[PDB]
Coordinates of C-alpha atoms and ligand atoms in Angstrom, one line a residue:
Chain A
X1 CA -17.3 18.9 -4.0
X2 CA -15.7 16.3 -2.0
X3 CA -17.9 14.2 0.2
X4 CA -17.5 14.8 3.8
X5 CA -16.3 11.5 4.7
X6 CA -13.6 11.6 1.9
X7 CA -12.5 14.9 3.5
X8 CA -12.0 13.1 6.8
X9 CA -9.8 10.4 5.1
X10 CA -7.6 13.0 3.6
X11 CA -6.9 14.7 6.9
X12 CA -5.4 11.3 8.1
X13 CA -2.8 11.2 5.1
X14 CA 0.9 11.5 6.3
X15 CA 3.2 14.5 5.5
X16 CA 4.8 13.4 2.3
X17 CA 7.9 15.5 2.7
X18 CA 8.7 14.4 6.2
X19 CA 8.3 10.8 5.3
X20 CA 10.3 11.2 2.5
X21 CA 13.3 12.9 4.5
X22 CA 13.0 10.3 7.2
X23 CA 13.6 7.4 5.0
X24 CA 16.2 8.9 3.1
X25 CA 18.1 10.1 6.2
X26 CA 17.8 6.2 7.5
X27 CA 19.2 4.7 4.3
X28 CA 22.0 7.6 4.2
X29 CA 22.8 6.4 8.0
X30 CA 22.9 2.9 6.6
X31 CA 27.0 -3.3 0.4
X32 CA 23.5 -3.6 -1.2
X33 CA 22.4 -4.7 -4.7
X34 CA 19.4 -2.8 -6.4
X35 CA 17.1 -5.7 -5.1
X36 CA 18.1 -5.2 -1.7
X37 CA 17.7 -1.4 -1.9
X38 CA 14.2 -2.0 -3.1
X39 CA 13.9 -4.4 -0.2
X40 CA 15.1 -1.5 2.2
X41 CA 12.7 0.8 0.6
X42 CA 9.8 -1.6 1.1
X43 CA 10.8 -2.2 4.8
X44 CA 11.2 1.4 5.6
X45 CA 7.8 2.3 4.0
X46 CA 6.2 -0.3 6.0
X47 CA 7.1 1.4 9.0
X48 CA 5.4 4.5 8.0
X49 CA 2.2 2.6 6.6
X50 CA 1.7 1.0 10.0
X51 CA 2.2 4.4 11.6
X52 CA -0.3 6.1 9.2
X53 CA -3.0 3.2 9.8
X54 CA -2.6 3.2 13.5
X55 CA -3.4 7.0 13.6
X56 CA -6.1 6.9 10.9
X57 CA -10.1 7.4 11.4
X58 CA -11.9 4.1 12.2
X59 CA -8.8 2.0 12.4
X60 CA -7.7 3.6 15.7
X61 CA -11.1 2.3 17.3
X62 CA -10.2 -1.3 16.5
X63 CA -8.4 -3.4 19.1
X64 CA -4.8 -4.2 18.5
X65 CA -5.6 -7.7 17.7
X66 CA -8.3 -6.4 14.8
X67 CA -5.7 -3.8 13.6
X68 CA -3.1 -6.6 13.2
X69 CA -5.3 -9.1 11.4
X70 CA -6.2 -6.5 8.8
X71 CA -2.6 -5.1 8.3
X72 CA -1.4 -8.8 7.9
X73 CA -3.9 -9.1 5.1
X74 CA -3.3 -6.1 3.1
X75 CA 0.2 -5.0 4.1
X76 CA 1.9 -5.9 0.5
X77 CA -1.3 -4.4 -1.3
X78 CA -0.6 -1.0 0.4
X79 CA 2.8 -0.9 -0.6
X80 CA 2.1 -1.8 -4.1
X81 CA -0.8 0.8 -4.1
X82 CA 1.3 3.4 -2.7
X83 CA 4.1 2.7 -5.3
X84 CA 1.6 2.8 -8.2
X85 CA -0.1 6.1 -7.0
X86 CA 3.7 7.7 -6.7
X87 CA 4.4 6.7 -10.2
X88 CA 0.8 8.2 -11.5
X89 CA 1.7 11.6 -9.8
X90 CA 5.6 11.8 -9.9
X91 CA 6.6 9.1 -12.4
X92 CA 7.2 9.4 -16.2
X93 CA 8.4 7.4 -19.0
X94 CA 11.1 4.5 -18.4
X95 CA 11.9 6.1 -14.6
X96 CA 10.9 4.8 -11.2
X97 CA 10.3 7.2 -8.4
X98 CA 11.1 6.0 -5.0
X99 CA 9.7 6.9 -1.5
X100 CA 12.9 8.8 -1.0
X101 CA 12.4 10.9 -3.8
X102 CA 15.1 9.1 -6.0
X103 CA 14.3 8.7 -9.4
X104 CA 16.1 5.6 -11.2
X105 CA 15.8 4.6 -14.8
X106 CA 13.6 1.5 -15.2
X107 CA 16.2 -0.7 -16.9
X108 CA 18.7 0.0 -14.1
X109 CA 16.3 -2.3 -12.0
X110 CA 14.5 -4.4 -14.7
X111 CA 18.0 -5.7 -16.5
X112 CA 19.4 -7.0 -13.1
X113 CA 16.1 -8.8 -12.2
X114 CA 15.1 -12.1 -13.3
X115 CA 11.8 -13.1 -15.4
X116 CA 9.6 -13.2 -12.0
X117 CA 10.4 -9.6 -10.7
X118 CA 10.3 -8.2 -14.3
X119 CA 7.1 -9.5 -14.8
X120 CA 5.8 -8.1 -11.4
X121 CA 7.3 -4.7 -12.4
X122 CA 5.9 -4.9 -15.9
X123 CA 2.2 -5.8 -14.5
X124 CA 2.6 -2.8 -11.8
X125 CA 3.6 -0.3 -14.7
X126 CA 0.5 -1.2 -16.7
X127 CA -1.8 -0.5 -13.6
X128 CA 0.2 2.9 -13.6
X129 CA -0.6 3.2 -17.3
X130 CA -4.3 2.1 -16.8
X131 CA -4.9 4.6 -13.7
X132 CA -3.1 7.3 -15.7
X133 CA -5.7 7.1 -18.3
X134 CA -8.6 7.0 -15.9
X135 CA -7.2 10.3 -14.4
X136 CA -6.7 8.6 -10.7
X137 CA -6.6 11.4 -8.3
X138 CA -5.7 11.9 -4.6
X139 CA -9.4 11.6 -3.1
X140 CA -9.9 8.3 -5.1
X141 CA -6.3 7.2 -4.1
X142 CA -7.1 7.7 -0.3
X143 CA -10.5 5.8 -1.1
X144 CA -8.7 2.9 -2.2
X145 CA -6.4 2.8 0.6
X146 CA -9.3 2.4 3.0
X147 CA -11.0 0.0 1.0
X148 CA -7.8 -2.3 1.0
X149 CA -7.1 -1.9 4.5
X150 CA -10.8 -2.7 5.5
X151 CA -11.0 -6.0 3.6
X152 CA -14.3 -8.1 4.0
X153 CA -12.2 -11.0 3.4
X154 CA -10.4 -11.0 7.0
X155 CA -11.8 -13.5 9.3
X156 CA -12.3 -13.4 13.1
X157 CA -12.5 -9.8 13.4
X158 CA -14.0 -8.7 16.8
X159 CA -15.3 -5.6 15.4
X160 CA -16.6 -6.7 11.9
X161 CA -19.5 -4.1 12.2
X162 CA -17.2 -1.4 12.0
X163 CA -15.0 -2.8 9.3
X164 CA -18.1 -3.6 7.1
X165 CA -19.3 0.0 7.7
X166 CA -16.2 1.6 6.6
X167 CA -15.9 -0.6 3.4
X168 CA -19.5 0.2 2.6
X169 CA -19.3 4.0 3.3
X170 CA -16.0 4.3 1.7
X171 CA -17.6 2.5 -1.4
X172 CA -20.7 5.0 -1.4
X173 CA -18.7 8.4 -1.0
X174 CA -16.2 7.1 -3.7
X175 CA -19.0 6.3 -6.4
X176 CA -20.6 9.8 -5.3
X177 CA -17.1 11.4 -5.8
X178 CA -16.5 10.0 -9.3
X179 CA -20.0 10.5 -10.5
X180 CA -19.9 14.1 -9.5
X181 CA -16.2 15.1 -10.5
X182 CA -15.9 13.1 -13.4
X183 CA -19.2 12.6 -15.4
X184 CA -17.8 12.0 -18.7
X185 CA -16.3 8.9 -17.4
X186 CA -19.5 7.1 -16.8
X187 CA -18.0 3.8 -15.6
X188 CA -14.9 5.3 -13.7
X189 CA -15.8 3.9 -10.2
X190 CA -16.4 0.3 -11.6
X191 CA -13.0 0.5 -13.5
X192 CA -11.2 2.0 -10.2
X193 CA -12.7 -1.0 -8.2
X194 CA -11.5 -3.5 -11.0
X195 CA -7.8 -2.6 -10.1
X196 CA -8.2 -3.9 -6.5
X197 CA -8.0 -7.5 -7.5
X198 CA -5.2 -7.1 -9.6
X199 CA -3.3 -5.3 -6.7
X200 CA -4.1 -8.2 -4.7
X201 CA -2.8 -10.8 -7.4
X202 CA 0.3 -8.9 -8.0
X203 CA 0.9 -8.5 -4.3
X204 CA 0.5 -12.2 -3.6
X205 CA 2.9 -12.9 -6.6
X206 CA 5.3 -10.3 -5.1
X207 CA 5.1 -12.0 -1.3
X208 CA 5.8 -15.4 -2.9
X209 CA 8.8 -14.1 -4.9
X210 CA 10.2 -12.5 -1.8
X211 CA 9.7 -15.5 0.3
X212 CA 11.8 -17.3 -2.0
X213 CA 14.5 -14.7 -2.1
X214 CA 14.6 -14.8 1.7
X215 CA 15.0 -18.5 1.6
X216 CA 17.6 -18.1 -0.8
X217 CA 19.6 -15.6 1.4
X218 CA 19.0 -12.6 -1.1
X219 CA 17.1 -10.3 1.1
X220 CA 19.1 -8.1 3.0
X221 CA 18.8 -8.0 7.1
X222 CA 15.7 -6.2 8.2
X223 CA 13.1 -6.4 11.0
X224 CA 9.6 -5.6 9.6
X225 CA 9.5 -6.8 6.2
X226 CA 10.5 -10.4 7.2
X227 CA 8.1 -10.3 10.0
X228 CA 5.3 -9.3 7.6
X229 CA 6.3 -12.0 5.1
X230 CA 5.5 -14.7 7.7
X231 CA 2.1 -12.8 8.3
Chain B
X1 CA -1.9 -13.8 14.1
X2 CA 0.7 -13.2 16.8
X3 CA 3.3 -10.9 15.6
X4 CA 5.5 -9.5 18.7
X5 CA 6.9 -6.6 16.5
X6 CA 3.7 -5.5 14.7
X7 CA 2.0 -5.5 18.0
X8 CA 4.6 -3.3 19.4
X9 CA 4.4 -0.8 16.4
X10 CA 0.8 -0.3 16.8
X11 CA 0.8 0.0 20.5
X12 CA 3.6 2.5 21.1
Ligands
470_301 C1 5.6 -7.6 -1.0 C2 6.5 -6.5 -1.5 C3 5.6 -5.8 -2.5 C4 6.4 -4.5 -3.1 C5 7.0 -4.5 -4.5 C6 6.9 -5.4 -5.3 C7 6.3 -5.0 -6.5 C8 7.0 -5.5 -7.6 C9 7.7 -3.3 -4.1 C10 8.8 -2.9 -4.6 C11 9.9 -3.9 -4.6 C12 10.5 -4.3 -5.7 C13 11.5 -5.1 -5.8 C14 11.9 -5.6 -4.6 C15 11.4 -5.5 -3.5 C16 10.4 -4.7 -3.4 C17 9.2 -1.5 -4.8 N1 10.0 -1.2 -6.0 C18 9.3 -1.4 -7.3 C19 10.3 -0.7 -8.2 C20 10.0 -1.0 -9.8 C21 8.6 -1.4 -9.8 C22 7.8 -1.8 -8.7 C23 8.3 -1.9 -7.5 C24 10.1 -1.0 -3.6 C25 9.1 -0.3 -2.7 C26 7.9 0.2 -3.5 C27 7.9 -0.8 -4.8 C28 6.5 -1.7 -4.5

């Protein structure tokens, strides 16, 4: 069984085919290297992440200033978690599955990148491998999305009451869920949570790299990614 | 932090 709270979280998930077709159609309607393409994917996915958050349970109760503070804190972690889960579900050996449904060979991306991006990509695929081995599932994924979004490290929130509540109760429901549905993995809950600091680290390194690439003139023109990089 | 575009996307 799935705890009531997690059932409520699942109801807020986007229609994946609709989002997939939207981004593919936008990029189709749109002189771009593979790196530029990845930036465009990130930018378009951020619009979908904001739309998802805005309409989600609990988040929709927050005033816009609180909503902004939370998203400014975690946007890159949500992008990376989204990517990681997509590889867990749809990915395979030596290929990368994109939000458009496009599958690209890993070397097509990696051979064209320098050390920093290669390291980040490699670290991301290690998380993919680890979460595979844990049998990371959709219920756990949506829980982690909410734990990433409702961070206790965000200062000056007006409604910290609600944010701490969500963090506490999603934690409780996730533990209940993993203890129930994966009893043979007695430490699954702890192993899932250990991935959050790793995602934070990768996300911060990714932001620093993209910030450098923007200063260097390598990030294609966009609206949202650049604004979030300055968040 | 102030960010006119993010604010707009959340409000619309
Ligand atoms: C701050 C942005 C964090 C997002 C990243 C960086 C993770 C290394 C992601 C991608 C990206 C890769 C290169 C340049 C720009 C962005 C994405 N492609 C990607 C491809 C292969 C491995 C890892 C990421 C594109 C959108 C989802 C992925 C998350």
